[PDB]
Design a protein around this motif. Structure first.
Motif, PDB file in Angstrom:
ATOM      1  N   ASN D  17      -4.946  -4.266 -31.177  1.00  0.00           N
ATOM      2  CA  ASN D  17      -3.989  -3.317 -30.116  1.00  0.00           C
ATOM      3  C   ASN D  17      -4.878  -2.638 -29.264  1.00  0.00           C
ATOM      4  O   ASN D  17      -4.597  -1.508 -28.967  1.00  0.00           O
ATOM      5  CB  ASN D  17      -3.196  -2.540 -30.890  1.00  0.00           C
ATOM      6  CG  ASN D  17      -1.863  -2.267 -30.098  1.00  0.00           C
ATOM      7  OD1 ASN D  17      -1.003  -3.391 -29.916  1.00  0.00           O
ATOM      8  ND2 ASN D  17      -1.399  -1.129 -29.776  1.00  0.00           N
ATOM      9  N   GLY D 117      -6.811  -8.673 -33.360  1.00  0.00           N
ATOM     10  CA  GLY D 117      -5.346  -8.820 -33.353  1.00  0.00           C
ATOM     11  C   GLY D 117      -4.865  -8.372 -31.945  1.00  0.00           C
ATOM     12  O   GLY D 117      -5.096  -7.422 -31.344  1.00  0.00           O
ATOM     13  N   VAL D 118      -3.956  -9.053 -31.503  1.00  0.00           N
ATOM     14  CA  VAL D 118      -3.233  -8.816 -30.231  1.00  0.00           C
ATOM     15  C   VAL D 118      -1.664  -9.128 -30.461  1.00  0.00           C
ATOM     16  O   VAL D 118      -1.255  -9.763 -31.308  1.00  0.00           O
ATOM     17  CB  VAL D 118      -3.862  -9.829 -29.138  1.00  0.00           C
ATOM     18  CG1 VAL D 118      -5.009  -9.785 -28.884  1.00  0.00           C
ATOM     19  CG2 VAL D 118      -3.432 -11.356 -29.531  1.00  0.00           C
ATOM     20  N   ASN D 119      -0.893  -8.549 -29.249  1.00  0.00           N
ATOM     21  CA  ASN D 119       0.349  -8.762 -29.145  1.00  0.00           C
ATOM     22  C   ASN D 119       1.300  -8.338 -30.411  1.00  0.00           C
ATOM     23  O   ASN D 119       2.655  -8.953 -30.335  1.00  0.00           O
ATOM     24  CB  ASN D 119       0.659 -10.602 -28.973  1.00  0.00           C
ATOM     25  CG  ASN D 119       0.041 -10.647 -27.442  1.00  0.00           C
ATOM     26  OD1 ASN D 119      -0.249  -9.706 -26.492  1.00  0.00           O
ATOM     27  ND2 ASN D 119       0.172 -12.077 -27.236  1.00  0.00           N
ATOM     28  N   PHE D 120       1.053  -7.457 -30.864  1.00  0.00           N
ATOM     29  CA  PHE D 120       1.823  -6.815 -32.042  1.00  0.00           C
ATOM     30  C   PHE D 120       2.916  -5.874 -31.038  1.00  0.00           C
ATOM     31  O   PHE D 120       2.441  -4.947 -30.527  1.00  0.00           O
ATOM     32  CB  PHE D 120       1.163  -5.789 -33.092  1.00  0.00           C
ATOM     33  CG  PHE D 120       0.279  -6.926 -34.074  1.00  0.00           C
ATOM     34  CD1 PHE D 120       0.918  -7.405 -34.843  1.00  0.00           C
ATOM     35  CD2 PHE D 120      -1.002  -7.035 -33.902  1.00  0.00           C
ATOM     36  CE1 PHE D 120       0.496  -8.301 -36.079  1.00  0.00           C
ATOM     37  CE2 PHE D 120      -1.558  -7.948 -34.925  1.00  0.00           C
ATOM     38  CZ  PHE D 120      -0.899  -8.439 -36.118  1.00  0.00           C
TER      39      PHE D 120
HETATM   40 MG    MG Z   1      -1.533  -5.301 -30.502  1.00  0.00          MG
END
Ligand code: MG
Ligand code: MG
Ligand code: MG
Ligand code: MG
Ligand code: MG
Ligand code: MG
Ligand code: MG
Ligand code: MG
Lengths: 215, 215, 215, 215
Positions: D17, D117-120
């Motif tokens: 993030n 990590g992405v798109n949480f």
């Molecule tokens: Mg994220």
């Protein structure tokens, strides 16, 4: 209600790649041992132009050996019974949907099944009948919205080696209130014991056992 | 063969969340203008316990305005015609499969449709009938294995705001040899023009236009 | 703040299939015309052993022509700016994650980019450098949790014909409060204008225009 | 080479993030017993604003008990060693990519790890630190393109009940020729044994055992 030996009757109506068919089955199993065997006959649409293996796991988690420490969603649901719905998402874009409404009369289970398959590549292993068997698997069972869901990484072993991957998601719905289990697993092994040339006649076996993982 | 004005008759048989239904339709469209309108009636299974919008895009890419520079797979396929199969993969795990076999007699198209939906959450927008409309969309069309495939990022606008995402993959199969198009797009807009309280009676419209992108 | 002509500087650090690299870029664009051009140079890890095209869409939705009737999330976010994160899910299991933190000083945008790719098949088109170009595309833009999300069905045209599909999901996060747009679309076209043998030096162009669909 | 007792040192660099961090670890395990324990310390980016559990399975299948009848891809690969790459696809759209390059010097394994990590979702269980533990799991191992792939249906148990599903795909690449195993399974159980308030200091344990299914 659910005895040591139970009989099974089923009718499947389906369409795969636009090909319509009907399959009827009769079999027997041992619910508390987690084993069952079925004889299947194609009644309409013979010869099937696709790999029979995509159908086999649609032909009842009553036939799974549950240990004392895990609530048995399936056996608890009878006499009223339960239904399930499944999606099968294959790695080359083929998708099947299936459902089974399972009723019990006396010592015989009756299955009303619908199966639909779409978007299978014409040169893929399903439409080219290049599958040998499903590998054994472990289903992950968990409660979501008060009903039971099972996810499975499945794989078909292919002619000439290699695997073809499919992801199963099944939702299982009891027709009465039952004690819900905590997260657990069901190990499965399904095999075609024998068949005739075009799979108009097939004898099928499954063994399944529930467990709580490592340990 | 495909004239400026064409009629449409359809029958859909389906099951969603185990609920069985039959819907019949009659309509008309303008193939070269890319517009069409249909009147639908529930014949069995009324009242439908799920959001009618999941059905609407199943109720024919003949009704899409194709420019001169893009081969028209659909219009070329007649008189023999074509069939399609579709998967609809919703973001909460709901999955539908559908198919349409499209035949032509005189000036009337006939649709034989099957629709199956599984694994919709009981408190999701589909089973709670909380959808308002599909947003417009752009379908990506490309040839794969000598037939035409269309992928679409779709979204339902929800009561109270927010969107519910679905991914479509449709395969389209001509019943004779046709000139295959290069990669292109089809813009769509589908709307329910009117309906009665339980959607037993629905009037539906679509507009669709093919194009080659930016430009 | 955002003028008719703006400059761009970027640094990308990344790893694909375990191969580490750094790419620096300088370019210029016209934010209100939706066009931009960039010169990119590999600074570490030359020659890249994978298809350069997987990187190109990571090398700013400021450069998209927004009409008066659609709030422009991106241009509104400056001077403070915005960041985005993206997943790229390819049909053969390859997955990339990327992020860009976009700052503005004077008339120059600065991009801090990270790119990671995993699980590309060694005989697939990415590791075999068999891609020709991305096709044009249409991004579906919608608000989810107070920030903007874009989904795209993308396709790489392959050497010898055929397409290789990828699904993009990008989340865009403004660093201040801005007026949120309703559901809309952005059409894109990205092209490599020229490159040297191992793509150590690349000139890249994009054109992008926002719209509300059919109409 | 791989002895009954082995030490482990690791450094992880990552971004989730947009939050950058470095974690260093030291531990020990018993490769032939399939057990290991590690002490981890956050060196940069403390306090982590996301659920620590997403990192834990990135902190070596050498530590898995392989029976005589299944070729051990991992232990066979040393002294040269192996690397792996992983995607983690969560049900709410969060996606992580990770890699580990595993080298051996004397009796100590060294791990070079990258995690992104992405798109949480900002109100999801990961960014709200609402996860309790990973459930045990069974990884499906199969050969594809001459290297080993592992797929896992994983689930995080959540505060207040319920599960959060993630699908793992890991590719494992030996740095020399090794005997390839047939399709098999690895059961896992990973637990945080202790941690301080912000997880700046964590003690982690895993147990893993390979097997061939039912039986
Ligand atoms: Mg994220
Ligand atoms: Mg098919
Ligand atoms: Mg599925
Ligand atoms: Mg349902
Ligand atoms: Mg789909
Ligand atoms: Mg790779
Ligand atoms: Mg993606
Ligand atoms: Mg994954």
């Amino acid at each position: 209600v659910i005895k040591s030996d139970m009989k099974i009757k089923l009718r499947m109506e389906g369409t795969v790649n636009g090909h319509k068919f009907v399959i009827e089955g009769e079999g027997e199993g041992k619910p508390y041992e987690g084993t069952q065997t079925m004889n299947l006959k194609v009644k309409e649409g013979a010869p099937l132009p696709f790999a029979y293996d995509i159908l086999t796991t649609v032909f009842n988690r009553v036939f799974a050996k549950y240990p004392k420490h895990i609530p048995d969603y399936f056996k608890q649901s009878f006499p009223e019974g339960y239904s399930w719905e499944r999606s099968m998402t294959f790695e080359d874009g083929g998708i099947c949907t299936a459902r089974n409404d399972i009723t019990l009369e006396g010592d015989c289970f009756f299955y009303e099944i619908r199966f639909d398959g779409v978007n299978f590549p014409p040169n893929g292993p399903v439409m080219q009948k290049k599958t040998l068997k499903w590998e054994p698997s472990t289903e992950k069972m968990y409660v979501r919205d008060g009903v039971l869901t099972g996810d499975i990484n499945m794989a078909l072993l292919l002619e000439g080696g290699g695997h073809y991957r499919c992801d199963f998601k099944t939702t299982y719905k009891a027709k009465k209130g039952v004690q819900l289990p905590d997260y657990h697993f069901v190990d499965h092994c399904i095999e075609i014991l024998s068949h005739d040339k075009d799979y108009n006649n097939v004898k099928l076996y499954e063994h399944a056992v529930a467990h709580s993982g490592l340990p």
